[PDB]
DNA sequence: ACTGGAGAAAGAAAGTGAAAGGAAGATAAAACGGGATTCATACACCGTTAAATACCGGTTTAAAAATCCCGTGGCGCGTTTTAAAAAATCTGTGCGGGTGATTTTAT
């Protein structure tokens, strides 16, 4: 799974299998919503185990 | 006149019914946040080419790395406090036969 953490806090992970490879130099999509006035800060990559 | 019992007055202490109010609860209206559709529209993938950048050979030089002396505060040791978690000890409760008791209405 993946996480992601927002500067004022909160936490959520979701399947790796959502998000399918591609070439350089594109936009990419939405992974989370933010509020409006926040950011994303730190992103990690683990096993639920 | 005097005595001792008894009833009535008077006075002081305790129980009482009623008391704002305030923290402590409780209950609704509202604002919120997270799913099902619906596309138009912007985004992903595929051929072409000018241009921008990576790379090699040889200097150099100024800046950073290396070395030596020393004087301290920042870790280390030993011994106390102090919350935090764990083990031990109490408290209720319901199963089924027994003993004994309570309340409101109409005519």
Redesign the pocket.
């Known amino acids: 799974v993946v996480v992601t953490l927002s500067h004022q806090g909160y936490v959520k992970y979701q399947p790796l299998s959502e998000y399918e490879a ?2 350089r130099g ?4 939405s992974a989370a ?1 933010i ?1 409006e006035e926040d950011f994303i800060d730190r992103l990690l990559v683990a096993n639920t185990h």
């Open positions: 591609q070439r594109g936009k990419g999509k919503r509020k």
